[PDB]
Ligand binder design. Structure first.
Ligand SMILES: *[C@@H]1O[C@H](CO)[C@@H](O[C@@H]2O[C@H](CO)[C@@H](O[C@@H]3O[C@H](CO)[C@@H](O)[C@H](O)[C@@H]3O)[C@H](O)[C@H]2NC(C)=O)[C@H](O)[C@H]1NC(C)=O
Ligand SMILES: *[C@@H]1O[C@H](CO)[C@@H](O[C@@H]2O[C@H](CO)[C@@H](O[C@@H]3O[C@H](CO)[C@@H](O)[C@H](O)[C@@H]3O)[C@H](O)[C@H]2NC(C)=O)[C@H](O)[C@H]1NC(C)=O
Ligand SMILES: Nc1nc(=O)c2nc(CNc3ccc(C(=O)N[C@@H](CCC(=O)O)C(=O)O)cc3)cnc2[nH]1
Ligand SMILES: *[C@@H]1O[C@H](CO)[C@@H](O[C@@H]2O[C@H](CO)[C@@H](O)[C@H](O)[C@H]2NC(C)=O)[C@H](O)[C@H]1NC(C)=O
Ligand SMILES: CCCCC/C=C\C/C=C\CCCCCCCC(=O)O
Ligand SMILES: *[C@@H]1O[C@H](CO)[C@@H](O)[C@H](O)[C@H]1NC(C)=O
Ligand SMILES: *[C@@H]1O[C@H](CO)[C@@H](O)[C@H](O)[C@H]1NC(C)=O
Ligand SMILES: *[C@@H]1O[C@H](CO)[C@@H](O)[C@H](O)[C@H]1NC(C)=O
Ligand SMILES: *[C@@H]1O[C@H](CO)[C@@H](O)[C@H](O)[C@H]1NC(C)=O
Ligand SMILES: *[C@@H]1O[C@H](CO)[C@@H](O)[C@H](O)[C@H]1NC(C)=O
Ligand SMILES: *[C@@H]1O[C@H](CO)[C@@H](O)[C@H](O)[C@H]1NC(C)=O
Ligand SMILES: *[C@@H]1O[C@H](CO)[C@@H](O)[C@H](O)[C@H]1NC(C)=O
Lengths: 273, 186, 311, 458, 48
């Protein structure tokens, strides 16, 4: 959504940072504990995708329906599960020759207490020296675990030092899909969410401006599993990368957007813009 | 021409409209800017005048075609159609010169006073043997079934002859007569 | 066939368009040289030319004699589309003015036109009222069927039209009811289904859309920054100093004056087109309407029989 | 407006008149005082690692700040310091570091030194104000302003491939090169650096930001964002709504000023963001703090026209579409209601005229005042001589009995004035400077001469 | 068409008629002025 102003019942050619047509993006899925012990996780955390201008995620789509457990052999219903994201400036190599270490001040985003609270820690992490938790040549990907505060698992996997603002936001517990976008400008980083101004559509509005004056260049999605025999499955969230593009949107009577052609998907849309 | 010559006194957001005044008052790096503004204004005025002349050329060409048509229709001949050569029925037209054009003098007819009268489609005898119709006129009655002939643009009745009457095919809409028939019908 | 013989009578003033009433912009326009008086003179000239053209056109429309009763009842053909009765307006004219996306006594109290009033231009009313224009049109009917003046019924007049084409007397007297049925069928086919697929109604809508688009562009060249920091002279006055205000207001004045000159040239071109259109309308009325033409193509495709003119 | 005394008789247009704004409105929802004391509180940051703060929803008092600094030179574009202390803008971004005035041209636009390419590079897309301020010793000791005597800037930032790393506009310096410069304790010009595996080449060059008297010189770059929404950063420096409605009123709401009329419309748009805009970037809406949506419009001028009569010397005023009601409520800046609009002159007459040389609009005339004002005459159609249709074989005819010639005079202008313009003699006056600037301007005189020659030949 | 394509080589008061030539020569603030002058010239030609 445009920041600071509202339009109504008009169609505007406005340019900004938007995802383009198609572009299904990366598809990420979390899973239950292996059916008890040894929580099951995916290849994530060895991938450091470029931040570029920013990204927007589809929060908790494919929920309220019957799906399938990723590690389970049977089918179960799927609920909304909030991703936890890592964002930093410089990435390097672990002592175990694995990728995913952030060598300076990094921003993490953690949902807390069964999705009631979400926190943003700007908290530079030192790798703890232990037996298997990021030791010498004994490594598996750090996993954020919780029962049926994720910072305790993070402090088990990492060491926290020079930590700054721990901004906490209250989000309601529901199974409706949302959206969440991160954009960086010269005023800092901007977080966007769909929960503000009531909850009516899929549009996102500005709700936080964290003072991150270092240019964020990499991001990764930290794995997360839930302790739970029982068959509980979790939804999928898709990451879409933004671009310096131009759009032509349409507003209804309320301050919302109904349809928005992308000027550049094909020639007819170039004419339509 | 007045609008063309009045753009020499327009400052166009400069210190003065005289190029010599700008040359004397100002330094070089501002001299070029002020003369650029002056050049923009004068060239815009010149292009506006060029477009004005080009627009007026089409109107002049269309008016030339119209003058040719009016001369070849209303002057050298009497126009059958009405309204193309002035108000009324055309009689004669004289063409004279004029400042930047042609002056036309059309002489109409313009009837003044009218008489309300009745007339038939044509006069035929008995059992539709041979019927006649008016040629540039109308058939009028004195009131005693005495049919006479009148002009199409003036009222002065005259007896019907074979010269102002043209033979036509019989119809049903004609008026049949019994006594005092005109000499063409005899 | 539709022939657009009118232009919009639009007047724009000096300082309400180039400026917004600020004394700084007015002073910088007075130092910029005098242009807007020329704009007012040119617009007054084209409006006077259009009013005189309309007066001459409706003087040439006028017939010396007319038969009001003939169009209403006498014709066995269903010519009620051109029958005149609030509005002295025929059915066809009501269909034309109703099925297009096109008053003056309380137009200010309403509030699109108020957007013109704040932008700095107005649309002048036409010289003849809609009722007077419709009555001038309705007087033209009643002289179509007259001469070979003499008042005639429409059926006999149609017989005389078709007799000179090459249809003999026995042909037309044999199947006159078929002729009336064909005429009524053609008129009904014209009346219904003419609002979606025809070139003439598309031309009417195109002319109305172009006349709206001219004013839309004239009002939309107010929001162009023209390279300045803002399109509002108030923001430039508040934000910048007294030395850099002159440059930005000069750029704004250049943009607005260029837009005004472009609109004036557009009005001149449209007037030069409308003069030719008015001459063509006069020719078509004095050839196809009051009489029967002998040359094909000049009064539509085919051999001409009769023609009517509506607003 | 026309510029001459003798005027032809006719109806003209004599410019609009606006309604002057009577009153004032002001909301300016209260905010917190700024934290600008941090600009003078801690150790002065160096150019290599310079601090940046972003201020939003803030109020600042410029006198208290400017009582502490001595401004040596300010370079501002698209804004002025006089406007920054009077106007309200959306956001404020301040960068500050220590730099001597002997290198005040290093930060100038277009410079080619190491600071403009390996240190803070200024961004010119928003209104900025770079201020070179000197803080004297007394105020520096008062606010605990100190110098660490270790100030340096990056003089070379090369990668592994032996090419310099240019810095993008309005960004902090490269984190590897900044850390390498900060970690050193001397001056080096080409020094290798091991940034967790990467081999970087860095160069550190020092400078002294103080003077003989101990006064510390600083550089304050201030970027102000003028956005479309409400302005929440204001400098420190009447009635209520529904006491005014339908009156042209200047605003002071949330730092946005202007003029126009408020009305109570139905709520339209999102309730959070205060203002509502249209396609042409013109504000039309306003959401109050109480949830009441006030729809906003410009105060609309009254379209007027003047009817002038020479040989009687009489002037009357007509209004384009203005009703007599809106005549009575607002100043104009008997009143006969007419299908065009109310007129301040004129007198009614039960008259008709066949044609009028002074038209007023929809078939209305203005006859010359031969009591004391104009006469509103209405043109109406005269009817032609009606002829009845007869069902019988005899039809009514109208044969004339008298006639008179009517001479019709028509003039058809079929010529244009054949004009040729010397472009060099018209654009310039023979001066060689103007001729050279026209030559470097790209030639236009050939096309003008060709076009005039073509139209004259045609 | 010859007059339409001959206004690309018009400097219009700028240092050069090529925008690429202006971009590599002048700084950020002067680039705006020169490109504004060029844009005004090309738009005037198009409207003509
Ligand atoms: C899966 O099913 C759940 C049912 O619990 C869906 O939640 C419901 O989603 C609808 C979407 O229109 C919500 O309606 C909207 O609610 C907001 C609340 O302010 C209201 O302002 C809107 O006008 C509209 O009525 C509905 O409230 C919500 N149910 C609850 C209890 O919150 C969910 O959307 C489904 N997910 C998918 C992907 O289909
Ligand atoms: C911005 O900050 C300045 C501080 O430099 C404020 O000036 C201060 O204004 C107040 C009242 O206008 C002054 O108080 C007065 O002091 C005299 C004695 O000096 C006393 O007799 C009066 O009754 C009153 O209390 C104060 O002295 C003055 N400060 C200085 C240093 O002169 C200014 O008001 C601030 N701006 C705003 C909008 O508040
Ligand atoms: N853990 C888990 N999460 C899931 O989301 C999940 N989903 C399924 C199957 N459910 C789904 C979810 C989405 C679509 C789907 O992508 N819908 C459409 C979109 C069509 C369009 O783009 O318009 C499709 O691609 O078919 C289909 C089946 C099975 N097991 C799961 N298990
Ligand atoms: C480089 O600059 C940053 C920002 O000015 C300094 O970070 C601050 O350091 C102090 C002291 O440790 C903390 O109290 C602040 O909270 C820090 N702020 C931020 C935003 O990180 C940093 O110390 C500077 N580097 C050096 C070597 O002095
Ligand atoms: C200053 C060196 C004088 C001699 C240089 C001679 C020739 C080199 C030619 C062109 C490059 C000139 C660089 C100008 C840098 C000054 C601006 C600054 O530094 O901010
Ligand atoms: C929105 O704009 C359209 C444009 O035509 C208009 O018809 C409609 O009445 C407006 N208002 C709504 C949809 O509430
Ligand atoms: C898993 O990630 C590693 C990166 O460490 C990559 O090399 C490998 O191809 C990935 N495997 C799959 C199946 O995605
Ligand atoms: C990044 O971390 C390293 C680790 O020692 C540190 O030296 C460096 O100063 C940090 N970067 C910044 C910008 O402080
Ligand atoms: C967030 O929620 C907690 C408890 O649910 C409450 O104490 C706190 O005040 C809330 N904060 C806000 C800003 O609503
Ligand atoms: C007049 O008489 C003839 C005689 O046959 C007839 O054919 C014709 O129809 C009659 N006309 C009228 C009008 O009665
Ligand atoms: C003529 O046509 C119209 C519309 O087709 C119809 O309403 C009217 O009744 C018709 N008149 C007749 C059949 O007399
Ligand atoms: C006087 O003016 C009024 C205006 O409403 C009009 O209705 C009336 O006909 C006029 N009287 C005349 C023309 O005699």
């Amino acid at each position: 959504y445009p920041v600071g102003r509202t339009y109504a019942n008009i169609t505007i050619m406005l340019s900004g940072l938007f995802p383009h047509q198609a572009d299904k993006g990366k598809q990420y899925i979390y899973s239950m504990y292996h059916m008890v012990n040894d929580p099951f996780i995916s290849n994530y955390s060895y991938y450091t995708e470029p931040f570029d201008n920013g990204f927007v995620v589809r929060i908790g789509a494919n929920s309220n329906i019957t799906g399938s457990s990723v590690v389970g052999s049977a089918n179960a219903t799927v609920k909304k599960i909030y991703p936890a994201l890592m964002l930093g400036s410089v990435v390097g190599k672990f002592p175990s020759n694995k990728t995913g270490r952030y060598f300076n001040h990094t921003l993490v985003i953690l949902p807390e207490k069964c999705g009631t609270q979400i926190t943003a820690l700007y908290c530079v992490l030192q790798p703890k020296n232990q037996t298997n938790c990021t030791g010498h040549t004994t490594y598996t990907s750090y996993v954020l675990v919780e029962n049926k505060n994720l910072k305790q698992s993070l402090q088990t996997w990492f060491d926290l030092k020079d930590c700054l603002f721990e901004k906490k936001y209250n989000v309601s517990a529901d199974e409706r899909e949302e959206w969440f976008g991160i954009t960086q400008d010269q005023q800092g980083v901007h977080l966007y969410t769909s929960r503000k101004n009531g909850f009516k559509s899929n549009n996102m509005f500005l709700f936080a401006t964290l003072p991150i004056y270092e240019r964020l260049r990499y991001y990764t999605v930290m794995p997360r599993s839930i302790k739970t025999n029982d068959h509980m499955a979790w939804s999928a969230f898709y990451i879409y990368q933004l671009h310096k593009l131009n759009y032509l949107v349409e507003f209804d009577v309320e301050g919302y957007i109904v349809r928005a052609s992308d000027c550049g998907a094909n020639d007819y849309t170039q004419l339509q813009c | 021409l007045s609008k063309l010559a009045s753009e020499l006194s327009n400052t166009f957001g400069a210190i003065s409209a005289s190029i010599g005044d700008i040359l004397k008052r100002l330094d070089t790096l501002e001299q070029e800017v002020q003369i650029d503004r002056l050049i923009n204004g004068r060239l815009t005025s010149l292009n506006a005048f060029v477009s004005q002349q080009l627009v007026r050329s089409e109107a002049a060409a269309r008016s030339s075609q119209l003058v040719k048509d009016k001369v070849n229709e209303c002057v050298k001949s009497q126009s059958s159609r009405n309204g193309f050569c002035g108000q009324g029925t055309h009689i004669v037209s004289f063409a004279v010169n004029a400042p930047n054009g042609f002056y036309f003098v059309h002489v109409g007819y313009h009837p003044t006073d009218y008489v309300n009268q009745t007339s038939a489609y044509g006069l035929c005898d008995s059992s539709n043997t041979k019927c006649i119709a008016a040629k540039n006129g109308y058939f009028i009655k004195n009131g005693s079934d005495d049919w006479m002939f009148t002009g199409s643009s003036y009222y002065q009745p005259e007896p019907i002859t074979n010269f102002n009457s043209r033979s036509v095919e019989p119809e049903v809409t004609f008026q049949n007569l019994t006594n005092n028939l005109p000499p063409p019908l005899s | 066939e539709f022939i657009e013989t009118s232009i919009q009578k639009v007047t724009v003033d000096c300082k309400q368009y180039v400026c917004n009433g600020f004394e700084r912009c007015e002073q910088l326009l007075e130092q910029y040289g005098q242009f807007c008086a020329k704009i007012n003179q040119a617009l007054h000239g084209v409006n006077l030319r259009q009013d005189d053209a309309t007066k001459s056109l409706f003087e040439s429309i006028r017939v010396p004699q007319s038969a009001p009763l003939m169009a209403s009842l006498s014709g066995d053909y269903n010519l009620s589309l051109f029958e005149t009765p609030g509005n002295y307006r025929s059915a066809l004219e009501d269909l034309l003015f109703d099925k297009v996306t096109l008053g003056y006594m309380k137009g200010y109290d309403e509030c699109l036109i108020c957007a013109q009033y704040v932008a700095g231009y107005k649309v002048l009313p036409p010289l003849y009222d809609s009722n007077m224009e419709a009555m001038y049109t309705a007087s033209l009917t009643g002289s179509i069927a007259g001469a070979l003046a003499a008042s005639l019924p429409f059926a006999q007049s149609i017989y005389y039209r078709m007799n000179g084409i090459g249809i003999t007397q026995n042909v037309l007297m044999e199947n006159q009811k078929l002729i009336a049925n064909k005429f009524n069928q053609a008129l009904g086919a014209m009346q219904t289904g003419f609002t979606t697929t025809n070139q003439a109604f598309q031309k009417v809508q195109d002319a109305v859309n172009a006349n709206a688009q001219a004013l839309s562009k004239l009002a939309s060249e107010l929001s162009n920054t023209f390279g300045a920091i803002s399109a509002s002279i108030g923001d430039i006055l508040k934000r910048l100093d007294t030395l850099e205000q002159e440059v930005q207001i000069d750029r704004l004045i250049n943009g607005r004056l260029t837009s005004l000159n472009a609109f004036v040239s557009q009005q001149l071109v449209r007037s030069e087109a409308a003069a030719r259109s008015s001459q063509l309308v006069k020719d078509k009325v004095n050839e196809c309407v009051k009489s029967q033409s002998s040359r094909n193509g000049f009064c539509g495709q085919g051999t001409h029989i009769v023609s009517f003119a509506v607003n | 407006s026309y510029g001459q005394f003798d005027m032809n008789s006719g109806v003209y247009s004599a410019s609009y008149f606006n309604a002057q704004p009577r009153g004032y409105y002001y909301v300016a929802n209260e905010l917190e005082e700024c934290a600008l004391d941090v600009l003078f509180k801690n150790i002065a940051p160096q150019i290599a690692n310079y601090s940046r703060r972003v201020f939003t929803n803030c109020n600042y008092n410029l006198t208290k700040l400017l009582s502490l600094v001595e401004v040596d030179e300010f370079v501002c574009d698209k804004t002025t310091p006089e406007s920054l202390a009077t106007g309200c803008y959306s956001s404020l971004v301040v960068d500050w570091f220590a730099l001597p005035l002997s290198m005040k041209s290093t930060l100038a636009i277009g410079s080619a030194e190491a600071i403009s390419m390996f240190n803070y590079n200024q961004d010119y897309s928003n209104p900025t104000c770079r201020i070179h301020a000197t803080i004297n010793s007394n105020v520096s000791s008062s606010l605990n302003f100190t110098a660490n005597n270790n100030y340096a800037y990056i003089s070379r930032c090369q990668g592994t491939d032996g090419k310099p790393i240019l810095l993008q506009k309005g960004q902090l310096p490269n984190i590897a090169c900044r850390s390498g410069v900060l970690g050193l304790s001397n001056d080096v010009d080409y020094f290798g650096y091991n940034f967790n595996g990467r081999i970087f080449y860095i160069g550190r060059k020092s400078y002294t930001p103080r003077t003989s008297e101990g006064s510390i010189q600083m550089v304050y770059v201030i970027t102000a964002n003028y956005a479309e929404g409400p302005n929440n950063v204001c400098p420190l420096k009447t009635d209520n709504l529904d006491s005014l409605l339908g009156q042209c009123i200047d605003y002071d709401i949330n730092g946005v000023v202007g003029q126009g009329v408020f009305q109570k419309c139905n709520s339209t748009g999102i309730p959070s963001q205060v203002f509502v805009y249209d396609s042409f970037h013109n504000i039309i809406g306003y959401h109050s703090k109480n949830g009441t949506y006030y729809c906003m419009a410009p105060c609309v001028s009254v379209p007027v026209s003047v009817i002038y009569d020479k040989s009687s010397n009489s002037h009357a005023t007509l209004y384009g579409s203005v009703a007599c009601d809106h005549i009575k409520m607002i100043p104009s800046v008997g009143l006969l209601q007419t299908a065009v609009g109310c007129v301040i002159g004129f007198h009614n007459t039960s008259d008709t005229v066949e044609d009028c040389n002074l038209p007023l609009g929809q078939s209305l005339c203005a006859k010359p005042p031969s009591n004391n004002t104009f006469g509103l005459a209405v043109m109406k159609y005269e009817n032609p001589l009606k002829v009845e249709v007869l069902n019988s074989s005899e039809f009514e005819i109208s044969v004339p009995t008298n006639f008179s010639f009517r001479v019709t005079e028509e003039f058809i202008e079929t010529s244009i004035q054949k004009v040729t313009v010397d472009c060099k003699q018209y654009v310039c006056n023979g001066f060689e400077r103007c001729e050279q600037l026209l030559e470097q301007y790209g030639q236009f005189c050939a096309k003008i001469n060709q076009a005039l020659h073509g139209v004259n030949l045609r």
